[PDB]
Every structure is written in structure tokens, then in C-alpha cells.
Amino acid sequence: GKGKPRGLNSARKLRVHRRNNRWAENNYKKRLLGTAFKSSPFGGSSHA
Amino acid sequence: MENDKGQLVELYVPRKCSATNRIIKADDHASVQINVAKVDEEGRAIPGEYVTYALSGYVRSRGESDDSLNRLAQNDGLLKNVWSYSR
Amino acid sequence: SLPATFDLTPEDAQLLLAANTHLGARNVQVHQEPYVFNARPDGVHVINVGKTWEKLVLAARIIAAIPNPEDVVAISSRTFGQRAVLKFAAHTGATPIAGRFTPGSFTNYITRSFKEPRLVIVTDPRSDAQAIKEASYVNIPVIALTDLDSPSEFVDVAIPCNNRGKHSIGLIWYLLAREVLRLRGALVDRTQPWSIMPDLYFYRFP
Amino acid sequence: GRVRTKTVKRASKALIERYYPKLTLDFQTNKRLCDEIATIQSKRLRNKIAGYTTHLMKRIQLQEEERERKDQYVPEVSALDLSRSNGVLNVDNQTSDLVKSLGLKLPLSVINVSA
Amino acid sequence: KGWVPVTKLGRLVKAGKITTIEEIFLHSLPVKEFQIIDTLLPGLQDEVMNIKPVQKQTRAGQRTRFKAVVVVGDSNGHVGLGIKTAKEVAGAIRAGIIIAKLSVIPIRRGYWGTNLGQPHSLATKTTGKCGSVTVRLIPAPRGSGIVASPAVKKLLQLAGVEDVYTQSNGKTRTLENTLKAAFVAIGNTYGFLTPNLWAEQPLPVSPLDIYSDEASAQKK
Amino acid sequence: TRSSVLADALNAINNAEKTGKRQVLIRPSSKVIIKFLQVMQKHGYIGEFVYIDDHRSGKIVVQLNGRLNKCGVISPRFNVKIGDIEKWTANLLPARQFGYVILTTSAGIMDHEEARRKHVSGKILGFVY
RNA sequence: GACGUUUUCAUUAAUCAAGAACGAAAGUUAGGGGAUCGAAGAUGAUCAGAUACCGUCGUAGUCUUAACCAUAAACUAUGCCGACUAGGGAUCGGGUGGUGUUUUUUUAAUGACCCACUCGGCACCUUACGAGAAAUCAAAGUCUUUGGGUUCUGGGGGGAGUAUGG
């Protein structure tokens, strides 16, 4: 069954499933917490 | 298989298995071509006119190599009750 | 197919039943019931020997078709038929092989013991272990003999007999060789004996 | 203890194989034979050939006749018949059902431990 | 010279009984010695992929082996791949031509959605695999050229193709596995039962029945 | 549990054909599977088959000629528009000029090109060759 | 639990957020004995770190009673219900008796057997068709020829199962 639901009502799971596994990706968590804005002394710039 | 006007494509028009009805490729290192010359009255050979068999690779590898050729000798007119149709 | 020249006859069944090949092998990996009929009441299998005769009927169709008698090869690592192949050879025209099968015989086209066969008849396809394994590279048919524990792998002509007693092997060797020489053509029938004995192809005790 | 000249042991395969009794144990007359015929161009190193192949005479004191052999010799009254068992044989009860069920003519004697 | 003919197939070819190349493929023949396909087809050319200096220790101080990977072929549907570690640069170069003449087999390549004067692309999506590398070829429209890695493109030139859409996967940067995998991938286009290959073959004769008196095993 | 009998169909014929048989005994079976196999016989990827019956589920015996390489259910049984069947072609079919996904629809059961011919498109069932 | 049944329900079903039982060893409160050894410890060691392995007594503990805990290499390192294939001589739990062989119910009774046959548990090894990177695996298969159903985890190494909070 390859560890996942498939049936055509289960999308409720799946877009909540990947929603909790994007945080294991690195630049996703780097991006969507404003860590480039709370740190990185350019402050998201390109020069200073 | 054929172009805008016909003209069949891709030389080495291959030959086929007669046991699993699969194909025999020019790679293959198990496929055997069998020339069964006939018999007749006086019962010798008639060498040259052949019941040509071909045996591919999966049958010869995975017990079922032998009984699959009993059927072909039966159902062509070569042997009698060596292959139980009522198996 | 089966001509009026030859089919099942009870005068060559003199020979096979005189060898007692109702003594087959005693336990059967299950690929080996087109040719058994029953077993004696302690469980040793009885052979449909008329179909074992049809085996040699098509086995000679295989042999006599080739316009090259040099292309006939017979292997015998089991000691019993090691005479028999020579007993075949100068009779038939097959090049004889007996003893140890040299590892990489059908491999290594450079070395001395490299044969170019078009047809190979084996004798004991367990004792001819790397003659079963390493022969199906250059696309060769495997004329074999098959007791009830003998390989259904890599074979196509499973001739049922025993290999316990020197008479069975040379017996079926002689029963094929007689009509191979008669497919090449000397004599006719089956109740008719050949000029030389079925005793001829058998094993001495030196 | 010693291994002298090694091109000697073909003495029992070159000269002896047609001419057996040539050599002699005493050595006062057996050494003229090796000067005329060969490229042996010495006087002292020459006669080392007898003693290294004298020791080969201590084991003693063509197979193509075995393919036409194989159609002549035969015991004419042998066990390759229905004769020494007098035809009737101890045969299985279902082999009698086999010569039934194929069509064959035999004598069928049956021994049994029960069924 | 000539061929000094061995293995009953040089005995065919040195006289001249087999004319074409695919005649040998037609019967699924064995090939043991190697210059047969170059006699049968002079159009091939030696196209080196890589000659890399491996210094594996030969037990007393390494004397500079070389593993060459040579893809021989004409760009007309006759390929060949040879891999050999040898003791010389030019020795490994010639050794890579030896094995690449043993390893010859063509590719059934066709059209894609129509037909016109000459075929361009493959017949079917195939895939070969060598341990670490998967190679997944795809049929292509007219003209679009070889979409492949810089090693794969020259081998598929010698396949005779003008257009492929390769979609390989795996640890491709071991370039020894990759061409083995892609050679499996091109060695399957005949070995795939497609609905155009649905006819019943008659199983015709072998020429090793025919020629066997004409120019065969000679004792003399 | 045999949640899809249509799935514990042809997987059985995978385990027959890949293991090299000429038939298999399918039990249970439905009119889903019966018309599925009538469609497959109409295409002739598989050969002749027979429904034998009990006062239970029922059995099917198939006599093909090899050309069934692979089939499979595409569960869950997705619902497809007209233009979107051709999406499902190029994902999981060998070439353009053969090969059939088949469909259950309110016009019964037929492959996706008879859907293109008789001008509907419905729920997926499987891919067959 | 298995097995037999031409007994009864006629879909009562699979897993599983939440929720609930149980739980080695060790450990945790209040008691019984207190025989056995014995993490700590109190002693003798005993010569440099041939190396500190030795030895002797040992509170609690080991054993239990009214209760926790909720931890393992809790590992067959493989969640649970499906499908088929190998190929085998035995096993054990059941079912059967060969003009079937003997002590003796009286040739095959109590029991047990050769030859066969069935479903339950524990296993083994073959060629590996299929895999895997590989050791190996009859399932770690039927997955690039990618979809029988369902649940929990992983995203380079560390920092770190650390801080913080519930």
C-alpha cells in the first residue's frame, strides 16, 4: 500500500501530510520564518 | 513498421518463441533452433525438410523446460501420448 | 510421423524390461510426470517405456538431419557409458568425449579442448554438471536422460531410465544407435536384431 | 645427491623403443656409438648418457587396435537374453498392468510381502 | 591473413557465405572472434569516450594501467561498447576496440505519430539499468536532437538516431555504469513485445544447416 | 480482505504470467471483472475465457497467447474529463500508436479511445497490455 | 489455538487520530521471610601502568503481598489484514484406514508403523524468475512495465534528542 492513503476522499490527509513534511526541507523553514530578516546582517539585501 | 508509401523498417526481422510465445533476441544465449527431419515409409530421415522448433531462455531456466516441448511434438504429428493432453 | 517401419514393439521391450527399469528413482521433484505409470508398492516408479521408445524415435530425427556427422558430440563423465560413447563413435561418426569436463571447454576458443558442436548428447546430467551449466551459452540442444531426481532444468529430451547398473545406460545408447545407423540406413525392423550385440556397449570390470 | 645432464632421459624413448637389448653394464666397449651421428663435439662430457638412463632399467626386467576391437569379441551364450532366469521374472503387479496398459507379451511372476 | 578461419563462422565468412550483418543476428548466432563485423561493415569508426590512467598496485610498484571505454560504430544502426583495463595507452585503445566488436547489436528505431521517407526516433519507451544507473529512453518528434548527457549523445549517434528524449536517473557520474545501463536500454527495442510485433513467425531455417558442406570444418 | 476483487484479479494473472502460466483461477469475480475481461478479449490482449459458476462468487478461466505483459488497476478510481484522458495516456503507456487505459463510465466499460469515439470520458479502471 | 461438522448471525468487517489494558531487567512506597549470592561499600590486596584482572564480608536487591514505572540490541534490527509461486524430507495439533507388516483383542489391536492425504505451528536449504548498491532476502517479491486497503516515522553530518515550552 506504499505507506500512504490513496482513496478519493483522503486529500484532507495529504495536503495536511505534506504540510508537516515541508518543514523537514531546509530552505522552506529558513524562508517562512523570516530568518533572513531576523538575522543575516545584509537583512535580505544584496549589498551594503 | 512502414513509411509514407510502405517500405518496411528495421532489418533483423526477428523470430519468436513457440513455447511461451515470447520473442527470441539476437542477444540470447539459451534459444535453441531444432531441425526435426521427418519420417515416411522406409522410416529413415528425409534430411532437409524440418519441423523447426525454437526454445527461449525463461523456459530453460525456471523445471518447466522439458514438458513444454512434449506438447509441440504431440500437437504437430511427431509423437503419440508422450504429452498427456489430459494432464 | 510414427512410421509403419517402427513404433512400440515387444521385441525391443525384451531389452528394456530385461534391464528392470521399473526401478526408477525414489523421490520426485514435481516436474516429472509425463512418463511414469505407477510405482511398485514400496514406492519405486514404473516407466512408460513405449514413450521412452518414442523419445529415441524423435532423438534420431534430431541426429540424422545434420549434413555434418562430425557435428555430433556425446559426453559421458559417468564411468558406465564411458565405453559406450566410443562404442557409438566409430559406429556413428560422433566425436567422443569422456572423463573430466575441462572447466571452460565451450568457453575459451583459444585453448586446445574447444569444441564446435551442433548437437550434444549427454549421459548423466548431474555428473555432467558443468556440461549442463556451461554448455547453454553457445545455444546447444541438450539430449539428456532423466531418472526421477535428474534435472528438468536446461534439458528438452528427458529420457526416463535408471543409472544404477551398467546395462541401462548402454542399453538405451544401443537402442538409439541402432536406428541412427538405420536412419543413415542399413537395416529395417525392430524384432529384427542388428548384426552386433546389445552386449557390445556395456561396461567391463577390469 | 646429484642431478647430472638432463637431455638424457629420452634414451628410453628414442633409441630403446626400436632396439631393446643394446646397453651393457660394463663400460670398457660401449662408448664409440656417440661420436659419428650427433653434434656431440667432445671427449669427456660425452659419455654421461649411459649412467643417468641405466637407472631406468629397474622398472622393467598404440591404442588404435581398440576401435576395430569393438565389433569382434562376444560371449555368444551370455546373460543378454531371456535365458539365465529362464524367461519368467519376478515382475511388479502393476508392471503386469503396464504390459496390459501398453500392449506387451511377457511372463509375469509376482513376489509379495503383503500388498 | 584472410582470416585463418576459426569457430565455423570465420569458415563461413572467409569464403563469403554470409553477406550482410543482420543475417548473423537473424539466427541469434554466437560471435567468438571479433573482426567479423568490421569485415561485414567497413563503415564503423573508432570513437573513444575515455582513457583514464588507473594506477592499481601490481604488487611491487604500479606500472600504470589504463581502462579505456571505446564506443565503436557507424551512425547507421550498428553499435559497440568495449571496456578494458590494460598495460598500455594504445594497448587499452586497441583492447577497447576488441570488446566493442564483440558487443554489436542494432536498435529497432522507428517513427512517432506519422510516417515519411526515413525513420527518426525509437519505437517504445525502454529502460536499462546497471547497478547504480537507470537509463529511460523516450521516443521523440522530428528534428529535436539528442537530449542526453555528453557521454550518451555520441553512443546514440552510432545508434543511428536523430532524436531521443533520455530521462536517466541514478548515480550517473560513475561513467562506467552509465554506458552499460544505456547499452542495456538500447539493447531492448527488439526485446519488447509490442503490438506491431504481433505476427506469427514461421521459424525458418538456420544457415548452419545450409552451408555445412560448402565451406565448413576442413581437416585436409 | 479483497477490497478490490478487480485488484486481486490480474495481480493473480501477473503471478500467473510472470511466473509463466496459461491460465489462473479467479475467485471472487464480478460483472465488473466479467465485462473487464470481455473488453480485454475484444481487444485480444488476452485470449478466450470462460465464466464457470457456483452458488457463491464464481470462477474465470483464461486461455491467452502470451500478449498480456502487464495490467494493473489504477485505484483510486479517478474521474477524468475528455481532454484529461490523454494526460493519462502519456504518463503510463508504452507508445502513442497502441496501448489502452480502459474506463468505466455511464456508457458502461470501454477503452479511452472508444471514449474518444463515442464522446464521453469517465472513471478510470486500469491499464492493459 | 488447531481440527471435524449439510448447526446459528447474514456483512455483524480491516487497520487505526483521540481513548484504554498490559509490561522484562532495573528503579519507585507500605509489609513477610531474611536461605542464596551480591551494583555500592568496609577490608586484605599487591608490585611502578608483566596488568590491575584478585580475594573476602556485604546494607538494600534477588523471592513474594496491596500498587506503580512504562525503559531495551522490547531485535526475526522487517506495522497489520490480501495473491501466487516454489521444492523438499521431517516435525507437531487434528482427521483416515490399504486381500498393509509384527508383541497380541484376534494378519493391519493399547500404541506404533511403510505407502498416501488434509488443514495448524516451528524451521530449514536449493536454483534466485524478482529484487537490493551489497551482505543477503520464497519475501527485504508481483515498483521507471511505478496505484490490493490502512497507521506511524526520515530529509547531509553534526550542534542535539540539546535548549525551550506543553
Question: For residue B82, what is the domain's CATH number?
Answer: 3.30.1230.20
State how many domains chain E has: 2
Handedness of CA C136, C139, C143, C148 (dihedral sign): positive
B50 close to B36: Cβ distance less than 8 angstroms: yes
What's the CA dihedral at D68, D72, D75, D79 to 10 degrees?
70
d(CA C191, CA D2): 70
Give CA–CA dist E189/E105, Å, rounded. Answer: 11
List Cβ neighbours of E218 (8 Å cut-off, separation of 6 or more).
E11
How far is C152 from B62, CA to CA, in rounded Å?
Answer: 9
Alpha carbons D81 and D87: distance in angstroms, whole number: 8
**C163, amino acid identity:** N
Contacts 24+ apart (CB under 8 A), E217-220: E217/C68, E217/C70, E217/C71, E217/C116, E217/E8, E217/E11, E218/E11
The one-letter amino acid at C143: I
C68 touches E: beta carbon within 8 Å: yes
Are E112 and F67 an interchain contact pair (Cβ–Cβ within 8 Å)?
Answer: no
Distance CA D56, CA C140 (A): 49
| Residues, chain E | 220
E191 and E136, same structural domain?
Answer: yes
F123 SS3 class: strand
- The backbone torsions φ and ψ at residue B79, rounded to the nearest 5 degrees and listed phi first, read -135, 160
| Alpha-carbon distance C137 to nearest alpha carbon in chain E (angstroms) | 9
E64 and E129 within one domain? no
DSSP E200: P
Q: Name every residue whose Cβ is closer than 8 Å to that of residue B41 and which is 6 or more positions away in sequence.
A: C3, C4, C5
Deposited experimental method: cryo-EM
Q: How far apart are CA F78 and CA F122, in angstroms?
A: 8
Q: Are E164 and E148 in contact (CB under 8 A)?
A: yes
Residue-number span of the structural domain to which E84 is assigned: 1-106
Contact yes or no for C127/C100 (Cβ under 8 A): no
E212 in any annotated domain: no
> Is F43 in contact with F99 (CB distance < 8 Å)?
no
Whole-number Å distance between alpha carbons of F123 and F102: 9
Chain E neighbours (≥3 Cβ pairs under 8 A) are B, C, F
Strand partners for E146: E164
Alpha-helical regions (H) of E83-169: 89-102, 152-158
What are the φ/ψ torsions at residue A26 (nearest 5 degrees)? -85, -55
- The number of CA neighbours under 13 Å toward the Cβ of F36 is 24
Residues in E touching B23 (Cβ below 8 Å)? 190-191, 193, 197
Q: What is the number of domains present in chain B?
A: 1
Nearest to E208 among C109, C118, C137 (CB): C118
Contact C102, C113 (CB under 8 A): yes
* Measured CA distances, B53 to C152, D100, E206 (Å): 19, 34, 11
Domain residues for the domain of D45 are 6-61
A27 CB less than 7 Å from any atom of strand G? no
* Nucleic chain G contacts, protein chain F, residues 25-54, CB cut-off 7 A: none
From residue C58, give the alpha-carbon distance in Å to each of B10, B82, B84, C124, D114. 37, 11, 17, 20, 41
**Nearest chain D residue (CA) to C84:** D70
Task: Give the burial string for B16-35 (b: 16+ CB within 10 Å, else e).
Answer: bbbbbebbbbbeeebbbbbb
Q: What region does E143 belong to: left with phi over 0, alpha with psi -120 to 50, or beta?
A: left
Distance B31 CA to G66 C1' (A): 80
Q: Which residues numbered 21-60 in chain E sit less than 7 A from strand G, measured from CB? A: none
- E strands present in chain E: 45-54, 65-74, 78-86, 126-130, 133-137, 145-147, 163-165, 169-170
Instruction: Give the nearest nucleotide to E132, CA to C1'.
Output: G133
The CATH number linked to D41 is 1.10.60.20
* Residues in CB range of C30: below 8 A, 6 or more apart: none
Query: Is C6 inside any structural domain?
Result: no
Cα–Cα distance, E40 to E101 (Å, whole number): 11
Q: How far apart are CA D107 and CA D95, in angstroms?
A: 11
Provide the pairing of β-strand C95-98 with C72-76: parallel
Please give the radius of gyration of chain E, using alpha carbons only, rounded to the nearest integer: 20
- Three cell numbers written together for C150: 535428474
Q: How far apart are CA C122 and CA C119, in angstroms?
A: 10
Cell, residue C57: 524415435
- β partners of residue F109: F104
Q: Do C66 and B41 make contact, defined as CB atoms within 8 angstroms?
A: no
State which residues form the domain around B84. 1-87
C-alpha to C-alpha distances, E176 to C57, C141, E57, E147, nearest whole angstrom:
52, 36, 20, 20
The answer to whether the Cβ–Cβ distance between E33 and C67 falls below 8 Å is: no
| Nucleotide showing the shortest C1' distance to residue C153 CA | G127
Residue that is written with C-alpha cell 509379495 in the block: D112
CA C204 – CA E80 distance, rounded (Å): 54
Residue type, B60: R
**Cell numbers that stand for B87 in this block:** 494432464
Distance from the C53 Cα atom to the nearest Cα atom in chain D, whole angstroms: 12
Smallest CA-to-CA distance from C198 within C66, C16, C73 is with C16
**In a domain? residue E217:** no
Sign (positive/negative) of CA torsion E171, E173, E176, E181? positive
DSSP F97-122: TS-EEEEEETTEEEEHHHHHHTT---
Please tell me if residue E217 touches chain C, with a CB cutoff of 8 Å.
yes
Closest to E104 in 3D by CA, of E153, E8, E34, E151: E34
* DSSP 3-state of E155: helix
Determine the Cα angle at C124 with ends C118 and C130, to 5°. Answer: 65
Contact E81, E105 (CB under 8 A): no
Which amino acid type is present at position E4? V
Q: State residue F51 phi and psi, 5-degree precision.
A: -90, 120
C65, C68, C82, C176: which is closest to C116 by C-alpha? C68
Q: Hey, what domains does chain F have and what are their CATH numbers?
A: 1-68 (3.30.1370.30), 69-129 (3.30.1490.10)
Q: How many residues does chain A have?
A: 48
The reply to whether E8 and E94 lie within a common domain is: yes
For A1, the 3-state DSSP assignment is: coil
Helix (H, G, I), strand (E, B), or coil: what is residue C170?
Answer: helix
Name residue D101's amino acid: S
Chain B: touching chains (3 or more CB pairs < 8 Å): C, E, F
For residue F54, give Cα distances in angstroms to C144, E4, E115, F13, F27.
45, 72, 52, 21, 10
**E121 in the same domain as E21:** no
Contact flag F66-B21 (C-beta cutoff 8 Å): yes
Residue E102, SS3 per DSSP: helix
Look up cell 544465449; give the residue: B29
CA distances from F55 to E14, F6, F50, F52, F58 (A): 72, 20, 17, 11, 8
Strands of E75-217, DSSP E: 78-86, 126-130, 133-137, 145-147, 163-165, 169-170
User: Directed axis angle between helix C82-92 and helix C166-184, to 10°?
Assistant: 10
Q: Residue E208's closest chain C neighbor by CA?
A: C118
User: Rounded distance, CA E75 to CA E120, Å?
Assistant: 12
Q: C-alpha cell of E108?
A: 529497432
Residue F123, chain A, CB below 8 Å: the answer is no
Could you tell me if C107 and C134 are in contact, meaning their C-beta atoms sit under 8 angstroms apart?
A: yes
Extract the C-alpha cell encoding F27. 475467485
What residues have CB less than 8 Å from D23, skipping those under 6 apart?
A: D30, D50, D54, D57
Distance in angstroms (rounded) separating the CA atoms of residues C81 and C175: 14
Q: Give E80: exposed, middle or buried? Use CB within 10 Å, 0-12, 13-18, 19+.
A: buried
Question: Using only C-alpha atoms, what is the Rg of chain A?
Answer: 17
Beta carbons within 8 Å of D112's beta carbon, 6+ residues apart = D93
Contact assessment for residue C40 and residue C63, using Cβ atoms and an 8 Å cutoff: no
Could you tell me if residue E215 is inside a domain? no
DSSP strand pairing (D89-90 vs E65-74): unpaired
What percentage of chain E's residues is helix, strand, coil (to nearest 5)? 25, 20, 55
C-alpha F39/C-alpha E85 separation (Å) is 56
Structurally, chain C folds into a number of domains equal to 1
Judge contact between B2 and E196, C-beta under 8 A.
Answer: no
Which amino acid makes up residue E153?
A: K
Q: F110 Cβ partners below 8 Å, 6+ apart?
A: F39, F102, F103, F118
In whole angstroms, what is the distance from residue D49 CA to residue D5 CA? 8
Runs of H (alpha helix) within chain D = 11-14, 49-52, 93-100
Resolution (A): 3.8
- Is B48–C57 a contact, with Cβ atoms under 8 angstroms apart? no
Q: Is the CB of F57 under 7 A from strand G?
A: no
- Tell me how far the alpha carbon of residue E54 is from its chain's centroid: 25
H or E segment at C176?
helix C166-184
Domain containing residue C171: 12-206
D74 to chain C, any CB pair closer than 8 A? The answer is yes
Numbered residues of chain B with Cβ closer than 8 Å to any chain F Cβ: 20-22, 58-59, 62, 64
Separation between Cα atoms, residue E8 and residue E20, nearest integer Å: 17
User: In this structure, are residues C190 and C16 in contact, taking their beta carbons and an 8 Å threshold?
Assistant: no
